[model samples]
Target: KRARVYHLTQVNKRLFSNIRETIPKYQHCFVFSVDNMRNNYLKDVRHELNDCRIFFGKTKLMARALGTTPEEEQADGLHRLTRYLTGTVGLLFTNRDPADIESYFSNLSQVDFARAGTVAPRTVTVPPGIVYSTGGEVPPEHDVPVSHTLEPELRRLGMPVRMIKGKVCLGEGYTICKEGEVLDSRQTRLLKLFSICLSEFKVSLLGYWSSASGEVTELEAGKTRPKREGNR
Candidate 1:
């Protein structure tokens, strides 16, 4: 067997070169922020924008590759793109129409199941009666009854459940989670079993740099303007 090692210098150098080389290949480069980040969701975005190049690497390294100062910027006004790189952000370089890119990011959102340690988006309380197979979005009357076999399982998972005749029942109101509540594994598992989705994934286009015009436009909250270098 041979030793297994990752060469950080080699990897960093490759990434740095790739970023610099890739800059001129696209007409527009966008800085984006991701909410409720998930790799699978990111894959969907990759496939959606099939021709775009997305780099979600270490911010400092990416910043360096793009140049954090006007003198160091790889392209005209690219240094301004580094301001919003402070958070969970990434860069996307694409030749696609700017209008299309805006509309896509504006409407891009997804709902998914919440995991343990996630803050609940809304309060969910199972009504006092026979617990159903689904809740949250569905009306209690329309919800299908959970199988009797899972009654013990639900009980074991911290629900105050019981068998009433042949059906599973909750004697009183059961709050699986509350709005802004930090969920535990048991609560999330209960939410999953009840078919409740609380996680929402989305991407926000914070700003973009157009190579053709050599300008930087910001889409910051409450402001929209293009600031060129040397402009006060």
Candidate 2:
């Protein structure tokens, strides 16, 4: 039989062991996930939660470290938490109380551009004249758009543009993306150019881990509703 070379190294093993050993020492642990968690944002989160430690890496490796697998299983019903440790899911260990940690994350959110395949929450119909999503000669709407300076680049990016009373406007009315529709690359890029914040930055709470209690409690994460429209 060919020797099976393992990709996981002693360093990785030690990391897992270290986290497992130390989790109980912390006052609280919580599961989390984020949308569009770019490096800078994560760095920001790290800076914000400097009092705590966050473990977000290879999903399976984390599961293994937590003894969630059959060969290395642990008690306190932590094995079930492994199931949720997928994708952006992470384990946040904190010396602070769980209530405090929960409150901190509950208020955290980032507004940024949506990725391709993300669903639009609102309808967007940008008539070429002026791209406005907020203010007008009307109720609850009025904003601004700009620069003939950006005209060349916008055109280069396939944006239909024309000079309107001196400023750049959409050349023609276009249905950029409709509500509840999946955004394609073109539409996502267009929305970014429009400066719309379609994606809601959030960290969802999945479960809580407590060493003293010897318990893992699964909780349903609630979604926050934003009254703000995509943009003006």
Error of 2 at 57 (Å): 0.5
In model 2, the worst 10-residue window by lDDT is 223-232
**lDDT by residue (tens digit), candidate 1, 191-213:** 88888888889787888899998
Best TM-score goes to which candidate? 1
- State the local distance difference test value for candidate 2: 0.69
Error of 2 at 145 (Å): 4.4
Give the Cα lDDT of each candidate: 0.82, 0.69
Q: 133 in model 2: Cα distance from truth in Å? A: 11
**Which residue pairs clash in candidate 2?**
128-173, 133-232, 134-141, 134-142, 134-232, 135-141, 135-142, 136-141
TM-score of each: 0.81, 0.72
Name the best candidate (by lDDT): 1
